[PDB]
Design a protein around this ligand. Structure first.
Ligand code: V28
Ligand code: CA
Ligand code: CA
Ligand code: CA
Ligand code: ZN
Ligand code: ZN
Length: 156
């Protein structure tokens, strides 16, 4: 688990799929999902070393877990720790979108951030930490009880 409650993140690079403001906005909103139900606070930084580095990359990208082209694996993230720990990577060969029509960035980022914070997967198809991606209505997006129980048992 992170052994602090103030956690920074940095966006390493941007996908050409979406407007930058939409990337910023999806990432910022995905952190809010988790800071709304825990005592964690997340700050974006623009220089220096962040706890959570957000990367868009294709294929092999230097961490011994290469991506696989369009389809299959969408993204992955490392559990809490220094260095690469916490970092969240998105497969650039996906087509990242603000709504539907590709792979939704916001929803995928919520799921990945859950792993950066120390969460495993849920057996609840309504949970964001469910292992399978589906587009759900963002307007009615809510964490499930199982998400809330898991994050709260790590962080309060
Ligand atoms: C054991 C298993 O899950 N096998 C399937 C296998 O069933 C599937 O056919 C294959 C396709 O290549 O992907 C395999 N797969 C998927 C994954 C999970 N993926 C990663 C992850 O959990 O974050 C990992 C790489 C870290 S993942 O597939 O990339 C992934 C990423 C995000 C989500 C998600 C969930 C809820 C909301 C929004 C997005 C779902 C899946 N791992 N292995
Ligand atoms: Ca890190
Ligand atoms: Ca892929
Ligand atoms: Ca892409
Ligand atoms: Zn990676
Ligand atoms: Zn997962």
């Amino acid at each position: 688990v992170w052994r602090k409650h103030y956690i920074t993140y940095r966006i390493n690079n941007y996908t050409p799929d979406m407007n930058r403001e939409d990337v910023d906005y999806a990432i910022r909103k995905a952190f809010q999902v988790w800071s709304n139900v825990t005592p964690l606070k997340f700050s974006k930084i623009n220089t220096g070393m962040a706890d959570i580095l957000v990367v868009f990359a294709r294929g092999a990208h230097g961490d011994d877990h290469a991506f696989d082209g369009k389809g299959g694996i969408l993204a992955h993230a490392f559990g809490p720790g220094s260095g690469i720990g916490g970092d969240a990577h998105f497969d650039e060969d996906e087509f990242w979108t603000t709504h539907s029509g590709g792979t939704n960035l916001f929803l995928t980022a919520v799921h990945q951030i859950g792993h950066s914070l120390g969460l495993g997967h849920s057996s609840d198809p309504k949970a964001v930490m469910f292992p399978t991606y589906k587009y759900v209505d963002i307007n009615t997006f809510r964490l499930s009880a199982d998400d809330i129980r898991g994050i709260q048992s790590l962080y309060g």
